[PDB]
Design a protein around this ligand. Structure first.
Ligand SMILES: Nc1ncnc2c1ncn2[C@@H]1O[C@H](COP(=O)(O)OP(=O)(O)CP(=O)(O)O)[C@@H](O)[C@H]1O
Ligand SMILES: Nc1ncnc2c1ncn2[C@@H]1O[C@H](COP(=O)(O)OP(=O)(O)CP(=O)(O)O)[C@@H](O)[C@H]1O
Ligand SMILES: Nc1ncnc2c1ncn2[C@@H]1O[C@H](COP(=O)(O)OP(=O)(O)CP(=O)(O)O)[C@@H](O)[C@H]1O
Ligand SMILES: Nc1ncnc2c1ncn2[C@@H]1O[C@H](COP(=O)(O)OP(=O)(O)CP(=O)(O)O)[C@@H](O)[C@H]1O
Ligand SMILES: [Mg+2]
Ligand SMILES: [Mg+2]
Ligand SMILES: [Mg+2]
Ligand SMILES: [Mg+2]
Ligand SMILES: [Mg+2]
Ligand SMILES: [Mg+2]
Lengths: 124, 124, 124, 124
């Protein structure tokens, strides 16, 4: 099972735990791992986003072509990449940088769980 | 990663897909797999519940001592078993027998996601 | 505004607060108030359900023809009555008898909020 | 009932419907109505935010001192104003400008529903 795994990374402590889990899943299933980081609607925003994505590439060890910067609402970006890469599993945190502890699950995780093309592994 | 995996099984088509995923995860991580099925508050209810649990034991191949019938609100039962068995991953469906398609995620999955002691793998 | 108001009543302390709010809204808007209580799939279940509905009729003062017992998943029952009675506002508790405090909003309120034909007033 | 009503306004079509409902509720209950619009973390952001708040003041007719610009995560801002103004009812849309139709309820409405000091009237 699981030939392609997609990690959604936002640089939060939950996403660093999710990156560890995704690296472990890819090794255990012999899968190809893709990491993605979305930025929302300049040079400054892209520099910041590239650095966050660099961190995800460093924690997972994936090749450059498998670490993607995407633009837009995070969940939409994650879902489009997942359909494009034919992901069999999406790994993401239950919460992220914007956590206040008032939602039961972060809004981008909620959206992905509702529309995902495959199983989603939520990491606390 | 993942030494103990807990599958929450309600006999729905989502939970049969979740049982396949949990069997595959346990084999890939060399983990011990526990399957649980909760029944809500007689002889008839227990007979029905034992049969549903038998199906989960047949699809996963776990030993008898690792297939548990529990009582109460499903999510509470799942969470207590998970803390008791020191589960490192809970696998459950996004929806179950009571699905109407109006919730974004079933209520028992919502409760587990909010209170789980470990990552939760949601299977559609 | 609001000519017909529907109260969804389950006999919980939240629903008793919601009944007070619904009585106050109906008086303030000069509206017709309907109270509904759903029971899930005998003589015993119906006796219990009629008594809960009697309590809602006593707290709101509505006429008998405007206090309805319905069957099925609560939210489905509430929504069908609301479309049937052309309700302009549904008043219900944020939580109910089955509250464990783990959901952000009870599952029947979640379903109604997602599919309602009109505004929904959530009472804590 | 309801002596102080707080409308959370984001300039979306749902919030314009919510403003109509809030104006009608304030008139029916003889209540004081407060409208609030939050902006997230310059001159440009404040100009845009003041114009959105002007629209809410125009649709509800409230006095200047009762139309407030607030800063921060919207739900936090709404909740703090509600405790400060001792609001007895918060009226807000089920969805807003960022709606994609994938959440069951928008994230700021979710947060307010979970932490509100009073009933919340959700307007579709
Ligand atoms: N820009 C982004 N790029 C990639 N993944 C993202 C992302 N934003 C969020 N995620 C993923 O979603 C997970 C859950 O975070 P989410 O953004 O849903 O909640 P949050 O705690 O930040 C509150 P909010 O719903 O207001 O954003 C993160 O751990 C991460 O895996
Ligand atoms: N009695 C039970 N025992 C074990 N697991 C259960 C269970 N009930 C539900 N689950 C687990 O929860 C998953 C999601 O189903 P859930 O019960 O949350 O939603 P549902 O679609 O049945 C609507 P509802 O929230 O009304 O019950 C199921 O696939 C199963 O893994
Ligand atoms: N059988 C029923 N008949 C009428 N209204 C009901 C109902 N069950 C619930 N409701 C309405 O829904 C409100 C919220 O309760 P809800 O049932 O959604 O959550 P809960 O706290 O009971 C946990 P659960 O989702 O497991 O049932 C109740 O206050 C009541 O207004
Ligand atoms: N900046 C803001 N100021 C005041 N009220 C706001 C607000 N943002 C949202 N709201 C209120 O919340 C309601 C629901 O919108 P919400 O922002 O929760 O969902 P949304 O559809 O914009 C998706 P998202 O959760 O990504 O923002 C809006 O109709 C409005 O009443
Ligand atoms: Mg976030
Ligand atoms: Mg169920
Ligand atoms: Mg209930
Ligand atoms: Mg239920
Ligand atoms: Mg919004
Ligand atoms: Mg957001």
């Amino acid at each position: 099972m699981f030939k392609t795994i997609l990690l959604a990374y936002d640089g939060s402590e939950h996403a660093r735990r999710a990156a560890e889990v995704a690296k472990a899943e890819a090794e255990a299933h012999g899968a190809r791992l893709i990491v993605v980081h979305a930025y929302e609607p300049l040079r400054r925003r892209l520099e910041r986003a590239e650095g966050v994505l660099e961190e995800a590439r460093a924690l997972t060890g994936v090749p450059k072509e498998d670490a993607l910067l995407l633009e837009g609402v995070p969940a939409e970006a994650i879902l489009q990449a997942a359909r494009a890469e034919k992901a069999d599993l999406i790994v993401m945190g239950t919460r992220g940088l914007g956590a206040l502890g008032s939602l039961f699950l972060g809004s981008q995780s909620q959206r992905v769980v509702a529309e995902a093309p495959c199983p989603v592994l939520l990491v606390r």
